[PDB]
Design a protein around this nucleic acid. Structure first.
Lengths: 493, 12, 521
DNA sequence: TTTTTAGTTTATTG
DNA sequence: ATAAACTAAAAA
């Protein structure tokens, strides 16, 4: 259970929009926090969250330190908690905030961070500061140095301090203040320098980038040869998010019920007394549990380098199961990262993939995988969209490739192809992996949200997976009727 | 010389 | 829907003749036959299998007379294969001292199909010849033999010790006799005469046959296809038919838990018990148990009755186009699911075939793909995926692969390596790995052909899991007292890279070992 | 202890 | 016959 604290500035500058249709820095923060809270419930993350405000007239904290309001203590995300955050969302929500507690009040960052640290007292400790003030305590020399000391004290404890700098007229400067406050990684290559957030979509992506901790699916040995062995971490960067499993409760108490599945004899009422059978016709083949696992056993757990196959030979189809990500693990074998880097640099250079014989766990049959060299990619927001390493591509065996019903080749005329080209060119759009949300899941959690808040009426969502029928029909009116006339005859069913 | 063959009645 | 298969094995004196280190063509053919029968027995296929042996000491066949069809024995008549047949291949069938006419054997095999399929109803008729071609033969009435094969609709497949550098490894990746050369030309001529130019592809070597599914190629059951409609907008609806191109073939049979003394499922019973989570646990009533779901900290009671009404109601099965984007925007790393669909044009529909063809070529030329919405039925959960063109000389289709939803994606940050001062390799270190990749390359390129030849096609190798399971299942069935046998060498030979790749890699691997220091924590 | 993967089992539709 | 849901096992 990791603890994460959202610290939001509530000074006069935070409630002012940069003369645009875009949301105020405060509104962006409130919505971003709310989005993380909702995301944590869907993803079923055990993480504890908190909401702390500073520069407010009304103060709510442990030692009654002036101008610090601890809205939510460190605890799991809830339906009532998200509802409390929704009371400050928007221009009408902004009014409710100003009424409950004050704003633009004199604060002391030293006292602010101390209160935040004290909330952790009750694995990873992290504070996320949402502010549009590049140089707080610019006038006060004493307050500025005191803040640097408490920021230093948090870092020496193990508390992470991350800046969520927002759009400020004339830009935001890190060199003036926060350069010493923020948590910097020991490695120059590890640290990421994000630009100031102007949109909610960019802020939410930056927050989830720093928040998340790497979870290795497995740590395996990449055996170049019997003696040349490096250690690698296998990471699942994509995993099918499914509907959470139900919990068996009681009709009156509504508390969970533990299930005990007991296996016993019928005639009388241990694993040594059990054997495994398979019956083919009249014959019954008998094998022990050890024997049934002995036949599954090939190789030993890890990746075995077969050689190097050029990427051109690897076909776009031949998809079997979702790909994995291979990254080195210096913690187990020292010098792995250097050889991995040398392999990655030369594989990208030569446009070739590393063919391996993958065995994920003990007593499991092998599968041929192709480690495709993946180069590092960072977007316009300076967020690592593509990590550096190898993509573990699962290759099918002869058995997995299914026979095809042999059909006669009928090719279209260049006039028919040319008309379809116009249809494609007009229906052109920009695809993002995160363009669509699972409608089954979104509705499921929308139903549970309303049920938790005892709301009789469930919020019925609109399916995003359905095509924009009217918009597409508006773009092409003549083209559809023109193409239909060219290929389909009038006597068609 | 080549060896002569007697095909099954169904082939003829 | 079953197929009549006749396995024609040469057991002649010359099949037993072995060169040191190289397995005798008889032992090689035996291994290929066992591989075939094991699959048909344990996968419980309804295909009937007959076995004819040529070059036997004796003569036992219906065409046997005088000097005609001599030294040919019909070992197994056409029927469903069993453990007794497998036991016969394993130990009962021995190599003979005589030599027979392979064409005479082909006729005996043909006569088996003509007479033993009279009562039964077979979709396919197939003969598999396993020989060395070292034996003398007659070309008398060959033209009629080829004609009768066509008229009876019987397919052929040849298996030789040779195929049409380093050491011999069976299953791995000196000079043929003049009699074998003469015999081969008739085999070539016959195969070309039956299946055209591509007929030569149906003549295999025993070694390659063990690391392929070619023995089942002709008796393989047709793939189940289903129809749907590709809808661009609303007014356009192309009639299509898609099937599962790639789908992971898994173990069909399950290990039933039985008692060590009685060996019965009936004596074993699994019972479920319910108890309260709180201290000093008490038995919970099976009828009073209600369904519930967690929403973070909160615990929400939600029954299956209210669930069916409030749940997401899918609009129905479809293959609707969401939009179109460039090939570069859809990355293979985002592919999801456990299948690949090949969207083909609806059978016996010419107008829909051209309509789909227009879309396939428009996307190919523009270097674009199609983002589509897919569901097999109205009950099934909706999917969003890529539909990309796939044009070959013989067939034309779109390929559907499921893409991810926002919820499916996971975002982690990994340390940069491009300019990492602590892990940056030296110029000597990089030039050592450069030599390793060049030495361990699994592809060869001929400058005259200008085509890249793969030396390790893994997609052609069958999953070792099945033939290993069949080996053990059969060994326990025939030899119950003996423990499980080890993995057959040819299975290991087919899984390991070509000997030339392993030998080439020796020198750069020793060089990278010294240059790259590695130690455990 | 929790999460992911694989294998059965059940239900619905053609 | 295909897809989803539930249960069990193994590894982080």
């Amino acid at each position: 259970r990791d603890s994460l604290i959202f610290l939001v500035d509530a000074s006069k500058a935070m409630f002012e929009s940069q003369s645009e249709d875009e949301l105020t820095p405060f509104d962006m923060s409130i919505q971003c926090i709310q989005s993380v809270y909702i995301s944590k419930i869907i993803s079923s993350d055990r993480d504890l969250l908190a909401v702390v405000f500073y520069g407010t007239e009304k103060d709510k904290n442990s030692v009654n330190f002036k101008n610090i309001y601890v809205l939510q203590e460190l605890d799991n995300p809830g339906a009532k908690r998200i509802l409390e955050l929704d009371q400050f969302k928007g221009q009408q929500g902004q009014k409710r905030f100003q009424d409950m507690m004050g704003h633009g009040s004199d604060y002391s960052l030293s006292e602010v961070l101390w209160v935040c640290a004290n909330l952790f007292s009750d694995s990873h400790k992290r504070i996320m500061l949402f502010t549009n003030e590049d140089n707080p305590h610019g006038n006060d020399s004493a307050k500025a140095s005191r803040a640097r000391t408490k920021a230093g004290d948090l870092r020496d404890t193990g508390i992470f301090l991350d800046l969520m700098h927002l759009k400020k007229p004339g830009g935001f400067d890190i060199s003036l203040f926060y350069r010493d406050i923020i948590s910097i990684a020991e490695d120059e290559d590890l640290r990421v320098h994000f630009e100031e957030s102007s949109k909610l979509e960019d802020l939410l992506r930056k927050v989830r980038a720093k928040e998340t901790r790497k979870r290795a699916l497995s740590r395996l040995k990449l055996k170049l040869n019997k003696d040349i062995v490096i250690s690698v971490g296998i990471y699942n960067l994509v995993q099918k998010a499914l509907k959470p499993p139900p919990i068996k409760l009681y009709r009156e108490t509504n508390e969970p019920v533990k299930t005990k599945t007991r296996t016993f004899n019928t005639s009388t009422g241990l694993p040594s007394d059990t054997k495994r059978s398979q019956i083919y016709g009249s014959r019954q083949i008998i094998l022990e549990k050890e024997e049934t696992e002995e036949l599954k056993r090939f190789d030993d757990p890890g990746l075995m380098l077969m050689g190097f196959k050029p990427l051109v030979l690897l076909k776009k189809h031949h998809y079997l199961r979702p790909s994995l990500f291979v990254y080195p693990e210096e913690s187990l074998v020292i010098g792995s990262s250097t050889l991995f880097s040398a392999l990655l640099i030369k594989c990208l250079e030569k446009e070739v993939a590393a063919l391996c014989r993958y065995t994920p766990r003990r007593n499991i049959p092998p599968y041929f995988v192709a480690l495709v060299p993946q180069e590092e990619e960072l977007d316009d927001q300076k967020i690592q969209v593509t990590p550096p390493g190898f993509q573990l591509v699962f290759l099918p065996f002869a058995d997995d490739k299914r026979k095809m019903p042999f059909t006669e080749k009928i090719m279209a005329t260049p006039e028919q192809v040319g008309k379809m080209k116009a249809i494609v060119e007009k229906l052109r759009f920009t695809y993002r992996s995160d363009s669509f949300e699972n409608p089954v899941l979104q509705q499921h959690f929308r139903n549970l949200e309303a049920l938790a808040l005892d709301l009789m009426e469930p919020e019925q969502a609109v399916d995003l997976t359905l095509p924009k029928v009217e918009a597409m029909n508006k773009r092409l009116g003549s083209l559809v009727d023109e193409f239909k006339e060219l290929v389909y005859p009038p006597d068609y069913n | 010389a080549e060896r002569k063959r007697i095909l099954p009645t169904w082939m003829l | 829907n079953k197929a009549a298969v006749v396995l024609c094995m040469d057991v002649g004196f010359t099949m037993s003749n072995s060169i040191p280190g190289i397995e005798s063509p008889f032992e090689q053919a035996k291994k290929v036959i066992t591989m075939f029968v094991q699959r048909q027995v344990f996968a419980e296929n309804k295909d009937e299998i007959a076995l004819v042996l040529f070059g036997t000491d004796g003569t036992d066949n219906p065409l046997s007379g005088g000097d005609q069809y001599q030294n040919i024995t019909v070992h197994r008549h056409l029927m469903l294969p069993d453990f007794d047949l497998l036991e016969d291949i394993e130990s009962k069938i021995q190599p003979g001292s005589q030599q027979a006419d392979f064409l005479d054997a082909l006729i005996v095999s043909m006569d088996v199909i003509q007479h033993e399929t009279i009562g039964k109803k077979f979709e396919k008729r197939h003969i598999e010849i396993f020989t060395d071609l070292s034996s003398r033969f007659s070309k008398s009435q060959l033209d009629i033999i080829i004609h009768s094969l066509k008229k009876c609709d019987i397919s052929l497949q040849f298996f030789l010790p040779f195929s049409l550098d380093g050491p011999f490894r069976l299953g791995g990746h000196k000079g043929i006799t003049e009699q074998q050369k003469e015999g081969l030309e008739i085999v070539k001529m016959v195969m070309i005469s039956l299946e055209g130019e591509d007929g030569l592809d149906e003549i295999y070597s025993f070694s390659e046959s063990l690391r392929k599914l070619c023995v089942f190629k002709k008796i393989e059951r047709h793939s189940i296809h289903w129809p749907c409609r590709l809808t661009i907008g609303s007014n356009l609806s192309i009639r299509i038919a898609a099937y599962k191109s790639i789908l992971q073939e898994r173990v069909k049979k399950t290990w039933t838990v039985v008692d060590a003394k009685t060996l019965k499922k009936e004596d074993i019973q699994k019972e479920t018990v319910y108890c309260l989570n709180d201290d000093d646990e008490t038995e919970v009533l099976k009828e009073d148990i209600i369904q519930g779901f967690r929403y973070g900290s909160d615990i929400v009671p939600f029954s299956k009755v209210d669930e069916e009404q409030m749940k997401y109601k899918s609009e129905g099965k479809c293959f609707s186009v969401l939009g179109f984007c460039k090939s570069s925007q859809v990355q293979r790393r985002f592919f999801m699911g456990n299948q690949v669909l090949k969207v083909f044009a609806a059978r016996d529909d010419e107008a829909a075939a051209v309509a789909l063809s227009s879309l396939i070529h428009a996307l190919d030329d523009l270097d674009m793909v199609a983002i589509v919405r897919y569901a097999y039925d109205k009950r099934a959960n909706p999917q969003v995926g890529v539909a990309f063109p796939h044009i070959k000389h013989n067939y034309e289709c779109l390929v559907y692969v499921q893409l991810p939803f926002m919820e499916d994606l996971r975002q982690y940050m990994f340390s940069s390596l491009k300019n990492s001062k602590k892990y940056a390799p030296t110029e000597a270190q990089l030039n050592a790995v450069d030599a390793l990749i060049d030495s361990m390359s699994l592809a060869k390129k001929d400058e005259k052909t200008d085509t890249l030849e793969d030396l390790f096609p893994t997609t052609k190798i069958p999953n070792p899991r099945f033939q290993r399971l069949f080996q053990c299942l059969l060994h326990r069935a025939l030899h119950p007292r003996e423990p499980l046998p080890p993995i057959q060498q040819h299975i290991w030979n087919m899984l390991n890279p070509p000997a030339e790749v392993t030998t080439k890699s020796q020198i750069p691997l020793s060089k990278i070992k010294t240059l790259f220091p590695l130690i455990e924590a």
